[PDB]
PDB file of C-alpha atoms and ligand atoms in Angstrom:
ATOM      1  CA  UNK A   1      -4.584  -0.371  -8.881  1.00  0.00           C
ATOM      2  CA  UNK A   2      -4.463  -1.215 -12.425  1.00  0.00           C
ATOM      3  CA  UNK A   3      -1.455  -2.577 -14.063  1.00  0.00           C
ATOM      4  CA  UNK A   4       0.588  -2.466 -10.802  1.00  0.00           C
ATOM      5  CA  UNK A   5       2.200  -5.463  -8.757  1.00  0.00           C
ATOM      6  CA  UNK A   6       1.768  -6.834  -5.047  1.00  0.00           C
ATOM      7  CA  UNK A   7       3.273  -4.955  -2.880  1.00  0.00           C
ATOM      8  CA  UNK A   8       4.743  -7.051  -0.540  1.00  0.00           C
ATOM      9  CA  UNK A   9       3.193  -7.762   3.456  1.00  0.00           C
ATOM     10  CA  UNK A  10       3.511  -4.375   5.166  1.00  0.00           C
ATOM     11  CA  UNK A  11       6.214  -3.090   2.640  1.00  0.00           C
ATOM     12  CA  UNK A  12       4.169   0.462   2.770  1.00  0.00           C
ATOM     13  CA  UNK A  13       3.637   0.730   6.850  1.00  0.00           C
ATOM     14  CA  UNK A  14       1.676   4.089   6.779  1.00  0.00           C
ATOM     15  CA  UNK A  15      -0.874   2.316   4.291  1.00  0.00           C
ATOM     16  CA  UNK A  16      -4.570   2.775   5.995  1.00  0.00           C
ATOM     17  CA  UNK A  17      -8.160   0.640   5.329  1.00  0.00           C
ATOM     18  CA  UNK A  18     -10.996   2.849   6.057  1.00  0.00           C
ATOM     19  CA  UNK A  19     -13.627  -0.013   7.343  1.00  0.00           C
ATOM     20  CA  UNK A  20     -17.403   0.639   7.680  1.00  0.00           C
ATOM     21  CA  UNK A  21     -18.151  -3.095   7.677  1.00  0.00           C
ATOM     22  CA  UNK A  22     -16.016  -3.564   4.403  1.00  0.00           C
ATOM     23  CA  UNK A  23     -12.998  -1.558   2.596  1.00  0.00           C
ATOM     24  CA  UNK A  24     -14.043   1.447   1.132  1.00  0.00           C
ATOM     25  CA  UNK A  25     -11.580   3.935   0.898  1.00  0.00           C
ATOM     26  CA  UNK A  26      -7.139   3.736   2.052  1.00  0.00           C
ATOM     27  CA  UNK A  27      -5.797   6.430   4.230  1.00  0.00           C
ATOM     28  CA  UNK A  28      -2.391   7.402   5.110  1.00  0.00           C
ATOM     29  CA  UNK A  29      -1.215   7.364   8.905  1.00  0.00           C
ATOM     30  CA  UNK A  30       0.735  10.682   9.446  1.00  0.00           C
ATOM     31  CA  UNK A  31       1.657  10.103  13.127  1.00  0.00           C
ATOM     32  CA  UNK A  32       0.187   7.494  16.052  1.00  0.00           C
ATOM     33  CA  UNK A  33      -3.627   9.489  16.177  1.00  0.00           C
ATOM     34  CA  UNK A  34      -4.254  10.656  12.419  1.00  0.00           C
ATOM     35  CA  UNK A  35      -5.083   9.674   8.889  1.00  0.00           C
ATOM     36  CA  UNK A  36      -5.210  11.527   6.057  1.00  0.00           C
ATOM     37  CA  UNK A  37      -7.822  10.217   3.221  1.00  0.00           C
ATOM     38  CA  UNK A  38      -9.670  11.808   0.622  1.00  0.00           C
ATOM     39  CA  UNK A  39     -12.667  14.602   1.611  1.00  0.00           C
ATOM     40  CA  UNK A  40     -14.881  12.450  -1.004  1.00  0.00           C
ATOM     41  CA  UNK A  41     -14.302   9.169   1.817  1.00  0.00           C
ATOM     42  CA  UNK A  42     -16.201  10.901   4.145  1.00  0.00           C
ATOM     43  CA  UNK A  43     -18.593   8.838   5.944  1.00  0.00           C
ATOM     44  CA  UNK A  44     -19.671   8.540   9.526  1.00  0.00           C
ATOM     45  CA  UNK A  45     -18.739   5.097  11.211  1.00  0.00           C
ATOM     46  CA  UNK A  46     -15.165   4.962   9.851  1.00  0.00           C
ATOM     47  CA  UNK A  47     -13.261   1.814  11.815  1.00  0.00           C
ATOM     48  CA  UNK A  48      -9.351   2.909  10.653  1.00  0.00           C
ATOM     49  CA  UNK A  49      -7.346  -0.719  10.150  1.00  0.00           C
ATOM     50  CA  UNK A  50      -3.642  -0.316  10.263  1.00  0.00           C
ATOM     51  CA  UNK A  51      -0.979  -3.088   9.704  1.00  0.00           C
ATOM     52  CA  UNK A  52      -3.037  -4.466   7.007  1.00  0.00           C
ATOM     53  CA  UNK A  53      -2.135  -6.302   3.986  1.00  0.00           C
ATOM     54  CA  UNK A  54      -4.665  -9.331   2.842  1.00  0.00           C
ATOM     55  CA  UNK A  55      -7.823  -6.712   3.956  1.00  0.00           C
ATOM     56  CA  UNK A  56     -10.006  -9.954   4.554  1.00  0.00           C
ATOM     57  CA  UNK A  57      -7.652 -12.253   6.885  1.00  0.00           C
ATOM     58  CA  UNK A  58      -6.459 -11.567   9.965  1.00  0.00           C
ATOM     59  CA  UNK A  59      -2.613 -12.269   9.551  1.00  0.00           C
ATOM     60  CA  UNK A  60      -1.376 -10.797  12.974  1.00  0.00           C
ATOM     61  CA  UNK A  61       0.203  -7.360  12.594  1.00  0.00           C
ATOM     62  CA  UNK A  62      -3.329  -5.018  12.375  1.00  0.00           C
ATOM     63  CA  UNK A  63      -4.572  -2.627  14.279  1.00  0.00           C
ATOM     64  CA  UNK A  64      -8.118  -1.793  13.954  1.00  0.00           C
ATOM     65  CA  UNK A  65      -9.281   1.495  15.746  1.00  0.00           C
ATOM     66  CA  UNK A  66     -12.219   3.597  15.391  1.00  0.00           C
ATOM     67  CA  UNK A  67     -12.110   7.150  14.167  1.00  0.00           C
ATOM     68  CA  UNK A  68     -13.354   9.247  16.749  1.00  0.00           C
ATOM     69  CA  UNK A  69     -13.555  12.465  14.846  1.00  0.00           C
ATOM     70  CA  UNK A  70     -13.241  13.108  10.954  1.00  0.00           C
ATOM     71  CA  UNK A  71     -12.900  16.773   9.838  1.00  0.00           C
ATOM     72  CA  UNK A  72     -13.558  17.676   6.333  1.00  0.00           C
ATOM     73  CA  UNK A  73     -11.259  20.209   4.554  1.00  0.00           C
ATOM     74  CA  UNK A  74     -13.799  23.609   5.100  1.00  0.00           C
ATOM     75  CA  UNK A  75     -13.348  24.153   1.134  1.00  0.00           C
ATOM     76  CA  UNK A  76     -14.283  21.007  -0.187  1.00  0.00           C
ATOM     77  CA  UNK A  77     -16.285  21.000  -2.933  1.00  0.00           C
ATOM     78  CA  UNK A  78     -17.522  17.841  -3.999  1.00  0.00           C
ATOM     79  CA  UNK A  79     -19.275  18.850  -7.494  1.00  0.00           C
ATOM     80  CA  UNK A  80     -15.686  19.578  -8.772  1.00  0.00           C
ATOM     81  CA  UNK A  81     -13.705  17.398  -6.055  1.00  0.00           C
ATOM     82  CA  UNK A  82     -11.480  20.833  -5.203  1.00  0.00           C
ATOM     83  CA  UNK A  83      -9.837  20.439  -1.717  1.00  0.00           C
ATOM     84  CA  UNK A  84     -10.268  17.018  -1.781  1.00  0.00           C
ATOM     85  CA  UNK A  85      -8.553  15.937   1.429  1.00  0.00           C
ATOM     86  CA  UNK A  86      -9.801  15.114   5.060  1.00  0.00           C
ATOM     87  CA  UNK A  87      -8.436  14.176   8.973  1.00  0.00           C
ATOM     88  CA  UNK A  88      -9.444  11.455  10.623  1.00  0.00           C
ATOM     89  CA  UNK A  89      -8.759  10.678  14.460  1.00  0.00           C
ATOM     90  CA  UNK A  90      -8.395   7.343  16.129  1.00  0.00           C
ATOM     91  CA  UNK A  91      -9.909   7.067  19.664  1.00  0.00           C
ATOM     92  CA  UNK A  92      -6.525   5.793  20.440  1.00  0.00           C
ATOM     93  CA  UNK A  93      -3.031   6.263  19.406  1.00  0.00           C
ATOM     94  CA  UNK A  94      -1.675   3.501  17.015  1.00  0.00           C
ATOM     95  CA  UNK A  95       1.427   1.624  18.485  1.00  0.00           C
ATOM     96  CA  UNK A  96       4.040   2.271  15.722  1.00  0.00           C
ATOM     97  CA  UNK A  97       6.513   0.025  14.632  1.00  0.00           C
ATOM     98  CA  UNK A  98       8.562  -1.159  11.340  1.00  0.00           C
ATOM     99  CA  UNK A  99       5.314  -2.711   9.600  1.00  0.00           C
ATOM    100  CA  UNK A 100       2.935   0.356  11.386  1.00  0.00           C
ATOM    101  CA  UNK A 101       4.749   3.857  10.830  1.00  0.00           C
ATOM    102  CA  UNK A 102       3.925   6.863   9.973  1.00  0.00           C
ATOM    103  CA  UNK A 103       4.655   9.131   6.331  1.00  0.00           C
ATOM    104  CA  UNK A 104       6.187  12.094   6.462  1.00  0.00           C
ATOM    105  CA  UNK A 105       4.552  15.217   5.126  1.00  0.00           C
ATOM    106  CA  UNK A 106       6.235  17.123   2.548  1.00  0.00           C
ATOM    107  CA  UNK A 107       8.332  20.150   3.038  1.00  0.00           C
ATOM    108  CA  UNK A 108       8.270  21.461  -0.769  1.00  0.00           C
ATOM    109  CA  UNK A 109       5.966  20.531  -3.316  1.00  0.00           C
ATOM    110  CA  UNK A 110       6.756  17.660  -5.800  1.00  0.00           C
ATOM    111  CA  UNK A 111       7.675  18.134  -9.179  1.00  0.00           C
ATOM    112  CA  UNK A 112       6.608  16.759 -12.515  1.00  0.00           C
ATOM    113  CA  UNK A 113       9.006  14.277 -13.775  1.00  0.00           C
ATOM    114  CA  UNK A 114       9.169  12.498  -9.874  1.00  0.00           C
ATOM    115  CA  UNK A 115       8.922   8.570 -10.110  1.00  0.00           C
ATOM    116  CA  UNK A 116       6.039   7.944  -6.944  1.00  0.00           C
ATOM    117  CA  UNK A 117       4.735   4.808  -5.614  1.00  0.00           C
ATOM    118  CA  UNK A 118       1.051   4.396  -5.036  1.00  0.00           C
ATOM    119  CA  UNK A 119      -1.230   2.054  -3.956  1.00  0.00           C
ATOM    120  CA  UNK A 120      -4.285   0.308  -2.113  1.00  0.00           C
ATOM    121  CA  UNK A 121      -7.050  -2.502  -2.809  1.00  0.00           C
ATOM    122  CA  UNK A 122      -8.516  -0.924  -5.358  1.00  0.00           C
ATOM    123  CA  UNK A 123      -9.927  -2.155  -9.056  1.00  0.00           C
ATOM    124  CA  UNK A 124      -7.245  -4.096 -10.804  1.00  0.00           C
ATOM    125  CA  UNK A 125      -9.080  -4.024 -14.146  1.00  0.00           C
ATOM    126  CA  UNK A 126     -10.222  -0.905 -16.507  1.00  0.00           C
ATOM    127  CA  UNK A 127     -13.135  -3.398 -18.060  1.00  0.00           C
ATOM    128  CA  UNK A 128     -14.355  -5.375 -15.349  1.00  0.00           C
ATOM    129  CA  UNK A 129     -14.151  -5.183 -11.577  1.00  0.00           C
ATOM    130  CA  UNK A 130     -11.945  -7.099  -9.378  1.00  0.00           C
ATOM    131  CA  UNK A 131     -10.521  -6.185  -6.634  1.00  0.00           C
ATOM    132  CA  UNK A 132      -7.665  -8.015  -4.611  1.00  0.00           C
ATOM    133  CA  UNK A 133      -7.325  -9.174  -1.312  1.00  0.00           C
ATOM    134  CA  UNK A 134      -3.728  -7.864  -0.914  1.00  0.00           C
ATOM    135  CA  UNK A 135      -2.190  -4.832  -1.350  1.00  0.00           C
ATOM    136  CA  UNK A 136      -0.902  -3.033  -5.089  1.00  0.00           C
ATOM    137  CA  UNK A 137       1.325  -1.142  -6.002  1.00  0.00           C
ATOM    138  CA  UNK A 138       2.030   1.127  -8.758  1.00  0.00           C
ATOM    139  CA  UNK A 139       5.173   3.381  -9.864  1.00  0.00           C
ATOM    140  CA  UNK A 140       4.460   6.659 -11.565  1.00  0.00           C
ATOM    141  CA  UNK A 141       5.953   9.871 -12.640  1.00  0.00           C
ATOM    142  CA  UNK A 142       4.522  13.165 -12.249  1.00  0.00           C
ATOM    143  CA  UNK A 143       2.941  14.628 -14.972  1.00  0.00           C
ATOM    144  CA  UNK A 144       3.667  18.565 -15.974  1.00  0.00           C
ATOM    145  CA  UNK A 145       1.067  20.665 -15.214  1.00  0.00           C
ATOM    146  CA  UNK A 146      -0.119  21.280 -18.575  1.00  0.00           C
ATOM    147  CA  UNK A 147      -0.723  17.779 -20.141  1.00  0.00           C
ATOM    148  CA  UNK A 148      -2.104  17.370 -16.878  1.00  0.00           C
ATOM    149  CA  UNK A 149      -4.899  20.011 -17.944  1.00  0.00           C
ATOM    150  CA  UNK A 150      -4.742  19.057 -21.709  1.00  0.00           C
ATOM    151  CA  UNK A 151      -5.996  15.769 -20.681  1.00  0.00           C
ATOM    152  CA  UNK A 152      -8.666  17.276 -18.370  1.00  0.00           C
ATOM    153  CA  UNK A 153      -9.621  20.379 -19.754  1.00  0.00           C
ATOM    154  CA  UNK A 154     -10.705  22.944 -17.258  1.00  0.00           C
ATOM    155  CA  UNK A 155     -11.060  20.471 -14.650  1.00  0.00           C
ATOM    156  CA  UNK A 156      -7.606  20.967 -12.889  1.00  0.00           C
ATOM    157  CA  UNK A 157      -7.209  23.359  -9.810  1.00  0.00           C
ATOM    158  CA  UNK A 158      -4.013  24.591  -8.147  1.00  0.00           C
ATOM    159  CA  UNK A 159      -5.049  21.663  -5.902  1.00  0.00           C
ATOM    160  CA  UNK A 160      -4.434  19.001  -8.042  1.00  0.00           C
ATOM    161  CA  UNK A 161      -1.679  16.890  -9.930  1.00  0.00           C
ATOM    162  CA  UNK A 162      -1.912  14.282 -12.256  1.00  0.00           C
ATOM    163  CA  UNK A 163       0.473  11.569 -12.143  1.00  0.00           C
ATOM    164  CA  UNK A 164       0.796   8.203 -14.488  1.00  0.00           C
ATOM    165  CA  UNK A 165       1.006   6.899 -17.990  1.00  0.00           C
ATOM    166  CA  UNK A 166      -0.589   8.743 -21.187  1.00  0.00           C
ATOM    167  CA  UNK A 167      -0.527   5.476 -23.221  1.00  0.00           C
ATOM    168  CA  UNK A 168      -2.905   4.065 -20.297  1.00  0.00           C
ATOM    169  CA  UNK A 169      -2.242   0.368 -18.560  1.00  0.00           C
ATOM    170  CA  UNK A 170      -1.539   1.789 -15.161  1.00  0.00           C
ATOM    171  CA  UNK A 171      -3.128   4.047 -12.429  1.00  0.00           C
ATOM    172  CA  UNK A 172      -5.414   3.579  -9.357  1.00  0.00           C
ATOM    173  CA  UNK A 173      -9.071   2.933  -9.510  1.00  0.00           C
ATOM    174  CA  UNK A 174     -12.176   3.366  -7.553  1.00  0.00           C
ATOM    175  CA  UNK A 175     -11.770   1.748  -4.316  1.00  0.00           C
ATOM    176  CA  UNK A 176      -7.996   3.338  -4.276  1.00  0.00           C
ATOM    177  CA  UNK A 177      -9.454   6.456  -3.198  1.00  0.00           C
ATOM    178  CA  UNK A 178      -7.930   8.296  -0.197  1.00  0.00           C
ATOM    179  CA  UNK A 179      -5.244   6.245  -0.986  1.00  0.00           C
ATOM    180  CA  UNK A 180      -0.938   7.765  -0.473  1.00  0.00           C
ATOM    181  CA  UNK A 181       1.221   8.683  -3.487  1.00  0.00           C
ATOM    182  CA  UNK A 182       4.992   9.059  -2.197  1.00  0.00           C
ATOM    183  CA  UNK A 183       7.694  10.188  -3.364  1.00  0.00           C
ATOM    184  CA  UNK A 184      10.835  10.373  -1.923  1.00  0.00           C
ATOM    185  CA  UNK A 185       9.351   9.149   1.359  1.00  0.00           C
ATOM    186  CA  UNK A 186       6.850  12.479   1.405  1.00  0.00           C
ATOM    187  CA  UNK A 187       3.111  12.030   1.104  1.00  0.00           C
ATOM    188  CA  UNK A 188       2.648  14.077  -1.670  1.00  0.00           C
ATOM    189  CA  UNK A 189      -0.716  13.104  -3.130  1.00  0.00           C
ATOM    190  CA  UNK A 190      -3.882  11.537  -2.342  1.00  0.00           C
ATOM    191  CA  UNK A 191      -5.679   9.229  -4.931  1.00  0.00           C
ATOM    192  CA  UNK A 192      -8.594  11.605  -5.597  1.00  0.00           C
ATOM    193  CA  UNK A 193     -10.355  11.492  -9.580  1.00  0.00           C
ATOM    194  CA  UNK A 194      -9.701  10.288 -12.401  1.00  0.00           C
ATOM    195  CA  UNK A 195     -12.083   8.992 -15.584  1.00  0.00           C
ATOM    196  CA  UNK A 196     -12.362   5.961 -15.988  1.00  0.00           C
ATOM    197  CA  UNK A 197      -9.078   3.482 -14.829  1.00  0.00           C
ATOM    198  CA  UNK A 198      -6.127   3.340 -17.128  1.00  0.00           C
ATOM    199  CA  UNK A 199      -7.632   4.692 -20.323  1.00  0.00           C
ATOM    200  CA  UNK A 200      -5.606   6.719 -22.803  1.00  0.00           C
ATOM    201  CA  UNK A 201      -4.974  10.185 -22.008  1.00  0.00           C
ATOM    202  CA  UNK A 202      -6.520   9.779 -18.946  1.00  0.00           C
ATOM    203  CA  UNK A 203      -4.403   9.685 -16.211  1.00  0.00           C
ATOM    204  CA  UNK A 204      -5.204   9.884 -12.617  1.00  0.00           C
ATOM    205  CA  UNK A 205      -5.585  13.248 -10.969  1.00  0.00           C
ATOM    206  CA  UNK A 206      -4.409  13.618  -7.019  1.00  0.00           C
ATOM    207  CA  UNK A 207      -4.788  15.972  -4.316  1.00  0.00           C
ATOM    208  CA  UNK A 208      -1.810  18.083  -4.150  1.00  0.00           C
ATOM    209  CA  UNK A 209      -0.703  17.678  -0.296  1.00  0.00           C
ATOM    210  CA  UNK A 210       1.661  20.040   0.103  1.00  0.00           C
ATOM    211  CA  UNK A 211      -0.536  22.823  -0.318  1.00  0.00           C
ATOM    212  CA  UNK A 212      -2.451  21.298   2.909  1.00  0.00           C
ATOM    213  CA  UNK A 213       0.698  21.216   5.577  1.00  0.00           C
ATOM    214  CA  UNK A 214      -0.132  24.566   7.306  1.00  0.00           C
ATOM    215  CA  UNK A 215      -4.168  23.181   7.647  1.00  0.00           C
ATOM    216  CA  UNK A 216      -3.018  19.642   8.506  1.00  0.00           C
ATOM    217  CA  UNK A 217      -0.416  21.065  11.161  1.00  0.00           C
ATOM    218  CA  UNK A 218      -2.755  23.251  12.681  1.00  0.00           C
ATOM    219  CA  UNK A 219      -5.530  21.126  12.973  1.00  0.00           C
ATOM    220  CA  UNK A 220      -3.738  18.378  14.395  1.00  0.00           C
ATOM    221  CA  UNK A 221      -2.331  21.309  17.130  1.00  0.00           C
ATOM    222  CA  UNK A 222      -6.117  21.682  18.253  1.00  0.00           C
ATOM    223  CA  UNK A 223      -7.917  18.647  18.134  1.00  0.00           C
TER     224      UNK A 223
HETATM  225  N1  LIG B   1      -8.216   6.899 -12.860  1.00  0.00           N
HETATM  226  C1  LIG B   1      -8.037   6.953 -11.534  1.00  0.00           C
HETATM  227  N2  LIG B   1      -6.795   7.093 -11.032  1.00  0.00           N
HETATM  228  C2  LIG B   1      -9.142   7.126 -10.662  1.00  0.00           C
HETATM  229  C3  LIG B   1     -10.445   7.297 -11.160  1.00  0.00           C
HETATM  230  C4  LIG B   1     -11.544   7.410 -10.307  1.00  0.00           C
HETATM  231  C5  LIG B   1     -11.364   7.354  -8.917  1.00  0.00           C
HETATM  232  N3  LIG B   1     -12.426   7.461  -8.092  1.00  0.00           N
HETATM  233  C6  LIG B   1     -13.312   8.468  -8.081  1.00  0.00           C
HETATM  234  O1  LIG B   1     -13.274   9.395  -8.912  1.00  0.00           O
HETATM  235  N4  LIG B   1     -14.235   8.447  -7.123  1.00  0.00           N
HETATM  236  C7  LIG B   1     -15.213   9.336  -6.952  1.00  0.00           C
HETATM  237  C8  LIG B   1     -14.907  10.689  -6.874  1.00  0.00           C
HETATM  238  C9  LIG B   1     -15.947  11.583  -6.593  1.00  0.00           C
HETATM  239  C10 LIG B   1     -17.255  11.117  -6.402  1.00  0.00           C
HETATM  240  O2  LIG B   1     -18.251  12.016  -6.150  1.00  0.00           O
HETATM  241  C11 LIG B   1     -19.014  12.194  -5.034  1.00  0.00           C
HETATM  242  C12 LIG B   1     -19.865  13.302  -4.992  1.00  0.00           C
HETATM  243  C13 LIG B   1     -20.674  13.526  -3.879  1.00  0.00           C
HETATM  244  C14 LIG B   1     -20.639  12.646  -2.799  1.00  0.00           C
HETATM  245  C15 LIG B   1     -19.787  11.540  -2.829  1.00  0.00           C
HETATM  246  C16 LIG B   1     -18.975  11.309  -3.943  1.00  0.00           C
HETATM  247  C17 LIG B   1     -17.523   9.737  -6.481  1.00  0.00           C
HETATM  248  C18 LIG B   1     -16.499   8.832  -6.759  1.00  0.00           C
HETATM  249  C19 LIG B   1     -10.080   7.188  -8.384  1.00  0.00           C
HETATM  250  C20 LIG B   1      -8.993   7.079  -9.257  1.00  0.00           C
HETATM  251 CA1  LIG B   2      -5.631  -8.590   7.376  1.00  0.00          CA
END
């Protein structure tokens, strides 16, 4: 997250770390068996840590479980990142709590103008690389539809939102990826694309969850 704060020790409970022997994606726990991360995360050996906040010290409130089954969205296309979204299962179900709980998914979809909050160890810097041991944060509105394809010209699907700051300074980064984006206590975004990291008229661009309920839903009811 560039230009964002800390968040505070488990302030954002449904906050994931997808481990394969280091960070590289966030996740969002939507009840005690699943994540939700990005379809671009994908990798096989995925070890899901939960109640985290300073990603390299054990502090005492994590859970670390393996996934035991990830399922890419069937129309994922990763040349143009459409249907960027995937489910991952833990072999075992999380014990939830106040600092390890679950987001709820959203019943409508969000509109532009909605103050968010978003976060995860990603980048902190849009020249340079540095990424924190704790977890950021960042608020952020919405952005309408069409600045959101004015900024990315033919680029933007009925899949995807963008949400920050035209002027640049704040957005997530690489290593935010997978990553929640909240509003109103719904999950209503996951930190997908974006070019570059806080630069001018380029704001980040997110998977637009609620157009996945009826897909998550039914795939948790099988699986
Ligand atoms: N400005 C941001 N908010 C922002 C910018 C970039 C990313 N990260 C990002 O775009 N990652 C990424 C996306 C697709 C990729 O493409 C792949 C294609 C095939 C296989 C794997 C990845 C690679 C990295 C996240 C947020
Ligand atoms: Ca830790």
């Amino acid at each position: 997250i560039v230009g964002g704060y800390t968040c505070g020790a488990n302030t954002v409970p449904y906050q994931v770390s997808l481990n394969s022997g280091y960070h590289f994606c966030g996740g969002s726990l939507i009840n005690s068996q699943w994540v939700v991360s990005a379809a671009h995360c994908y990798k096989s050996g995925i070890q899901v840590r939960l109640g985290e906040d300073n990603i390299n010290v054990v502090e005492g409130n994590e859970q670390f479980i393996s996934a035991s089954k990830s399922i890419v969205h069937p129309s994922y296309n990763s040349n143009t990142l459409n249907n960027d979204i995937m489910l991952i299962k833990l072999k075992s179900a999380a014990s939830l709590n106040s600092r390890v709980a679950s987001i709820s998914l959203p019943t409508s979809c969000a509109s532009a103008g909605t103050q968010c909050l978003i976060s995860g160890w990603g980048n902190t810097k849009s020249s340079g690389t540095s990424y924190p041991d704790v977890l950021k944060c960042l608020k952020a509105p919405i952005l309408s539809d069409s600045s959101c394809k004015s900024a990315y010209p033919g680029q933007i699907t009925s899949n995807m939102f963008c949400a920050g700051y035209l002027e640049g300074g704040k957005d997530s980064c690489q290593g935010d990826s997978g990553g929640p984006v909240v509003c109103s206590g719904k999950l209503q975004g996951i930190v997908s694309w974006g070019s570059g990291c806080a630069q001018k008229n380029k704001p980040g661009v997110y998977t637009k969850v609620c157009n996945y309920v009826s897909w998550i839903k039914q795939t948790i009811a099988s699986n």
